[PDB]
Design a protein around this nucleic acid. Structure first.
Ligand SMILES: [K+]
Ligand SMILES: [Mg+2]
Ligand SMILES: [Mg+2]
Ligand SMILES: [Mg+2]
Ligand SMILES: [Mg+2]
Ligand SMILES: [Mg+2]
Ligand SMILES: [Mg+2]
Ligand SMILES: [Mg+2]
Ligand SMILES: [Mg+2]
Ligand SMILES: [Mg+2]
Ligand SMILES: [Mg+2]
Ligand SMILES: [Mg+2]
Ligand SMILES: [Mg+2]
Ligand SMILES: [Mg+2]
Ligand SMILES: [Mg+2]
Ligand SMILES: [Mg+2]
Ligand SMILES: [Mg+2]
Ligand SMILES: [Mg+2]
Ligand SMILES: [Mg+2]
Ligand SMILES: [Mg+2]
Ligand code: NA
Ligand code: NA
Ligand code: NA
Lengths: 400, 221
RNA sequence: GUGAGAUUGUGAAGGGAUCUCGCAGGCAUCGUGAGGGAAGUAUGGGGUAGUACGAGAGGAACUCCCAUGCCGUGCCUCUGGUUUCUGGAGUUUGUCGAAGGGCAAGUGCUCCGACGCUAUCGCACGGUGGUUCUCGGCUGAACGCCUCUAAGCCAGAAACCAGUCCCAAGACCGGGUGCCCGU
RNA sequence: UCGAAUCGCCACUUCUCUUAUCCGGUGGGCUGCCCGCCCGGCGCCCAGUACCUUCAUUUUCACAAGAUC
RNA sequence: GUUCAUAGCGACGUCGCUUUUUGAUCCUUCGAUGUCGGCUCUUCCUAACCUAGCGCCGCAGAAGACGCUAAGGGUUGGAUUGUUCACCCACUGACAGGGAACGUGAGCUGGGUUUAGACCGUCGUGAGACAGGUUGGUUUUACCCUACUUGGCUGGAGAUUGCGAGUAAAAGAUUAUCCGCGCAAAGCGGAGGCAGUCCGUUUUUUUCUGGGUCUGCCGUUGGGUGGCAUGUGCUUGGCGCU
RNA sequence: GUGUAGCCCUCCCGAUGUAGACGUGGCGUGGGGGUGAGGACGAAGCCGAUGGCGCGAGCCUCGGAUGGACCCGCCUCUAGUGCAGAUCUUGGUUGGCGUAGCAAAGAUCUAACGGAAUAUUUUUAAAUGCAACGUUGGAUACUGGAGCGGGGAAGG
RNA sequence: GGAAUGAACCGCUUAGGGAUAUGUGGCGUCAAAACUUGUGGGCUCAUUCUCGAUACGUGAAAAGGGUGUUGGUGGAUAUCCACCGGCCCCGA
RNA sequence: AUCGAACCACCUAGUAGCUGGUUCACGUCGAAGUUUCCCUCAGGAUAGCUGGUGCUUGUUAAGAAGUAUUGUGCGGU
RNA sequence: UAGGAAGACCGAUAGCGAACAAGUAGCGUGAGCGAAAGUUUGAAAAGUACUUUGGAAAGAGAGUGACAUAGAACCUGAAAUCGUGACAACGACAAUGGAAGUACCUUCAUUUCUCGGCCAGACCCAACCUCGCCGCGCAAUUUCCUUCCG
């Protein structure tokens, strides 16, 4: 017998299994299609989630009821210290897939990079990359590197660079890890010879996020979702609850199959792990590319709001702290909790729509406290509402 | 494959350097799929080691539309309750040949599993097979003794594309590179081939007068 | 050959014979992607335009633009809900001699209440190419007329396949790299 | 440490294409006949066809009691 | 059907298909396969209601009829009734039809049906009967195997053994006996000398040390620069040094 | 000389079978009448990679690093005479399984003492003797006079 | 022992074993046999539940259509008309 | 803890055309589900099919035959 | 109630319910119902003095005895089920099963050892079964062949 009435199935079958991610780091599975006409450039960057806020701006959109008016849009702040490039890898194409040719190392690596190869770095001999350093610049060392670079030129189709983040510069108290996060970034544009030239120039040097993305562009966000543990079918899949009178419980699926086939099928909802999955979530628009507060104190100052303030809210980002580095501001939400490392990628979908080509001009950035109902923008506003307090008077009296 | 330290150490003590088993390399260009698979499967059961190359040049009788529809019917079959257990639909031409041969073997006994282990089935002619030796053909399945001229036929590579195979451009790029390298090398050493030919000639008039007559009697000189 | 064991049914010392096992990898990282899954879908408005057609009456459509319904993947800046931070305050009966400070009433009860969790009750986002069917044509015979069909060629559905997306080497990767050990 | 089964090999084979196709290519004369032109190998018992030269009792088959790896 | 068999229909006849109705049978089950409907949830079919693409009309425009390819996606909220079915009120692009043991009770519910109490009508002399109406009437057990959902530990290439040797690797005294450019070319470039021991059937034999002068390097010293995002690494210029 | 280890040697013809019938110098068990043996230099019973014989039911030898007092061959007579299942009877053992659980009546903490129940290490102190018991003092709390108060009948 | 599978179909009917030859059924692989036999003829192309291929086995098909192609029969004229088969296609 | 007739012992091992069970080997043979009668239709008696024991005989046929030939009758599909 | 005589009987789940402190223990308001259980260690208690660890129970030694694996519910001591040492290997076809070989094990049996009942090869005689090569009969080879014409 058919169903009495029709309604669509719950959930998406293209995100199976709902199992825990193999790694915590966000990783780009695919990279944008290479265009040989453009100049060589990098395609991704690594950032850390550092809380949320909202802004005000004027929208330019002819034919819309909101044209030439102000709107309020929530945003996400992500800290972006510069990355360091340490390696070059080349790939060749075979009838069975892509295979790595080799690797060229930078001969000078930091302690935080070599921490990634140990589980107890302090109580260890710390011998990683020691023999390569003693051999790289010798006469046999230069010949060996020239041999590998020749194989890159002759029989490669893809060039990538090995880069790691700098966790020493990101002086965060709640991020406990001291070993760098390492990933691969593809170089797009130009020929193979030109791609290798850019990679060699960017060896041992730092790469800033302003050189990879522009202010009013879009990007993709590879990240790992917040975890929820073992959860039931109502929260995991979104099925309806049963009537109050049900014996043995309500938060269940009543029928998990028919008599035939004589088994449970993979399309029926069951309880299990929820959250901590990898997602991609394309088309997030960049609203601002900031700089470190040590060099540019007025981060949140706007042409329409001349107050001198930084991007950090009053009392700090809850659970994270201060933003002491460069940052990016993205429109909307981002997967994962605070302190997690996130990969931003240049887009795959076409970027010719009017929404994606709009130019953004901010007008106001909110910096009130996120604890409680914040109602002051700066610390001077609070000290102007209240006059001198009891503790201020005592300090002055002691000063006398 | 991948000799461990146990294997390399034993070879070092014994003094062995290299070894190559007796293998037949078959060029599968312009061969009927079903007839070649049946001949090869019987030879595998008789204790032979066979490597087949250029699996993308196998031919099937009928039009491309007819054969593409036949594959799409096979692709429709899957275990409804758990498709990851169901039949697996391989897409490369070399995988299709191995599946066809497997269905002509007893595959649920150790004897048949061992026989299937002796077939390699490359696509194109890889670099590790080029210089091994001369290739062979199967005259009973050569498609110029098998098909009438006016009948339409399908090339396996073209049919494997359009149903999921995504390495047609890679295979044709590598094959063209091989032809140029092999053609350049073969034009070289034309001097030594001519010199040997000019050596067998004029060897006569240097041999004794009786051995030349025996050669003439048997049609060798 | 060499290094460890065992020969355990009717004392305790010695030697012999034989049988088993080991004689080479380990840890740590960056990737590949066969195969399997697979997702976006629909309505309205602006303009076209009171235009095309029509005696009149009546009355279209494509490019382009702006919104919304259902579904999907996430998030907590704002708004709402939730309080065993029993946080701060208030208040009833009993109780410690009174005030202070408390305690009991399985959280006594009332108000406000952070962090966290959460709601289409709040916010953000939801792509690209090919092979073809029905059908429509071009050249063109059979059949010195013709014919979209016999050979050949072109265009082409919310269908099908691949890309993007999720899992991924029992798919046994002779893919790369760092250090230790043996040779 | 291991006694093992397997018993052609080559820097002349180890390039390509056709079968309604000059099957080594290739022109001419009058719709098939006729006439011209040019260019796998070794290996099997003297390193080579020739004079010379040790084969035993392992004294009638037995995994070649010998090789390769 | 304005005339016009076939736009659309189509009588009198005749040929089929389906198993979603009801009959016919009695093959399996009576030391028991839980018997209606609704709720919840997944999947399949097409004989296509809406959405996509085409042809044709008794298709001026608009609105429609019919036919073909198409099952990718969708198909509602309520009043009375236990209902399935039906009928009304509204919304909508549309409110299509079916299968899965008449899907689904160790998933629920228990209104209906179908025990024991009791009332009515008709029937019976009576005990009692009625597929007639009415009211009240226990819904038991998973900790086993498999399936499914997540969660971990660990072997394995003769898929645990053989010593049973096949690279989507290079290209040569049979990979030995050096590096760079070049097309598996033509050709063109670079290389430190001395003495000893132990080994040595050859061609400047194979090694092990000591000075022997060192290009390229590692680890330094300060001092002057200089770059990077700025407590940590480097590059230039001299000290001796391995 | 029906039938046995068939008195022996040639030759010819048939050979399966449920329910059922019949045959066998066919096998095995407890006891009686006869006959002939065996046993403390080890009877019965028990065990087995102990083999040999027979189509088979079975028989016999061997070893016990088993046992410690009875027992068998043959001819006959006799019967409470042969087990895989009866939701069979009586004992024993068993996976499930160190599993399901041991969740009403609010609740204990601290020091000293007692105790074999510790402060147990030979290969600085914590990371190598845990957990739990009674009494007394102190703290906290419950019953809340229709009481886990103080006395009786029935019953014990 | 054969028809992949089946109480009943085909062959054959049964003491324990060798050699030889057959029956039904077969000789591309699974799988023994034409290592894909003939120095024998014809016919057939079948696009979405996918041409056809072992009887019993309705263990699936009809009426009605098609110059798709290959054969016959009977009439006019030096190609035309009517009718009937085979294989394939629609009806499905 | 028992009620459309309590409990205890006995008649009582009540009767059952119905359900379940029924313990060694080899050898020679080997069926029936049909007829008539029965308060008979899930059962019997009776004949048929089978086994055992034979009797009387014979060595080409005695009173042989699921088959032909010749002669001579019958029949209404 | 006292004696006697026996048995082709049963032999501890049998024979009386009772081989034993049995109409007992136990059950039921009651009438009534009603078991299990061989103390069978050894000829003889000679029933383990004493040393050492342990709170004790016990363990490790010593001793009695022909035997202590005869140690006290103690003759013999089976099967089901379990622990330990050694070994054999083995993917997933649930295992078990049949046939025919092979690789390792055999506290088994029989034969031989200067002739052998061992293992192979070739040869001879008889019998049976095949292949090559060479032929015959028939008016089967005249519904035919060959010439010259119309
Ligand atoms: K699919
Ligand atoms: Mg209930
Ligand atoms: Mg907040
Ligand atoms: Mg797939
Ligand atoms: Mg795929
Ligand atoms: Mg049941
Ligand atoms: Mg059931
Ligand atoms: Mg159920
Ligand atoms: Mg009356
Ligand atoms: Mg018999
Ligand atoms: Mg007796
Ligand atoms: Mg028994
Ligand atoms: Mg538990
Ligand atoms: Mg109280
Ligand atoms: Mg009281
Ligand atoms: Mg065969
Ligand atoms: Mg019976
Ligand atoms: Mg018989
Ligand atoms: Mg008794
Ligand atoms: Mg008794
Ligand atoms: Na009786
Ligand atoms: Na009667
Ligand atoms: Na019966």
């Amino acid at each position: 017998s058919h169903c009495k009435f029709e309604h669509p199935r719950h959930g998406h079958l293209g995100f199976l299994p709902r199992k825990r991610s193999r790694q915590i780091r966000g990783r780009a599975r695919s990279f944008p299609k290479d265009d040989p006409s453009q100049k060589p450039h990098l395609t991704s960057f690594m950032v850390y989630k550092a809380g949320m806020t909202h802004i005000v701006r004027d929208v330019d959109r002819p034919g819309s009821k909101v044209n030439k008016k102000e709107v309020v849009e929530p945003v996400t702040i992500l800290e972006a210290p510069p990355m360091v490039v340490v390696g070059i890898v080349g790939y060749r194409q075979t009838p069975v897939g892509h295979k790595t040719i080799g690797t060229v190392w930078a001969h000078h690596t930091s302690v935080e990079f070599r921490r990634r190869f140990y589980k107890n770095w302090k109580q260890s001999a710390q011998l990683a990359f020691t023999k390569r350093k003693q051999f790289a610049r010798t006469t046999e060392g230069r010949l060996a590197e020239a041999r590998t670079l020749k194989a890159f030129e002759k029989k490669a189709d893809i060039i990538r660079v090995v880069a790691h983040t700098q966790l020493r510069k990101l002086r965060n108290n709640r991020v406990g890890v001291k070993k760098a996060h390492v990933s691969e970034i593809q170089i797009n544009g130009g020929t193979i010879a030109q791609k290798i030239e850019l990679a060699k120039s960017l060896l041992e040097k730092e790469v800033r996020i302003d050189s990879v993305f522009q202010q009013s562009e879009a990007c993709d966000v590879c990240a790992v979702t917040k975890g929820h543990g073992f959860t039931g079918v109502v929260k995991r899949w979104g099925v309806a609850c049963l009537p109050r009178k049900t014996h043995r419980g309500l938060r269940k699926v009543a029928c998990i199959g028919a008599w035939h086939p004589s088994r449970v099928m993979y399309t029926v909802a069951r309880a299990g792990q929820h959250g901590y999955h990898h997602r991609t979530h394309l088309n997030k628009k960049i609203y601002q590319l900031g700089r470190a507060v040590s060099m540019e104190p007025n981060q949140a100052t706007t042409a329409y709001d001349l107050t001198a303030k930084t991007i950090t809210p009053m009392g700090g980002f809850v659970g994270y702290g201060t933003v002491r580095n460069d940052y990016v501001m993205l429109k909307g939400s981002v997967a994962g909790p605070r302190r997690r490392v996130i990969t931003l990628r240049r887009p795959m979908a076409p970027q010719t729509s009017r929404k994606l080509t709009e130019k953004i001009t901010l007008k106001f950035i909110d910096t009130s406290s996120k604890i409680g109902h914040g109602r002051f923008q700066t610390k001077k506003e609070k000290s102007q509402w209240y006059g001198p307090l009891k503790k201020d008077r005592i300090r002055r009296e002691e000063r006398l | 494959v991948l000799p461990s330290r146990r294997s390399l150490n034993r070879s070092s003590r014994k003094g062995f350097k290299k070894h190559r088993p007796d293998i037949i390399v078959i060029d599968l260009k312009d061969h009927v799929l079903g007839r070649a698979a049946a001949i090869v499967a019987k030879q595998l059961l008789l204790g032979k080691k066979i490597t087949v190359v250029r699996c993308e040049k196998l031919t099937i009788a009928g039009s491309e539309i007819r054969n593409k529809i036949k594959y799409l019917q096979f692709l429709r079959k899957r275990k409804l309750s758990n498709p990851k257990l169901g039949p697996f639909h391989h897409r490369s031409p070399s995988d299709v040949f191995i599946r066809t041969v497997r269905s002509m073997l007893p595959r649920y006994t150790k004897r048949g599993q061992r026989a299937l282990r002796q077939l390699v089935a490359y696509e194109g002619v890889p670099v590790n097979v080029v210089r091994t030796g001369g290739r062979v053909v199967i005259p009973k399945a050569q498609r110029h003794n098998c098909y009438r001229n006016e009948r339409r036929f399908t090339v396996l590579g073209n049919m494997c594309k359009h149903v999921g195979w995504k390495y047609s451009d890679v295979v044709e790029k590598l094959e063209a590179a091989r032809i140029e390298k092999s053609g350049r090398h073969h034009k070289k050493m034309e001097k030594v081939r001519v010199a040997w030919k000019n050596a067998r000639k004029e060897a006569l008039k240097k041999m004794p007068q009786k051995n030349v007559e025996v050669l003439k009697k048997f049609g060798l000189a």
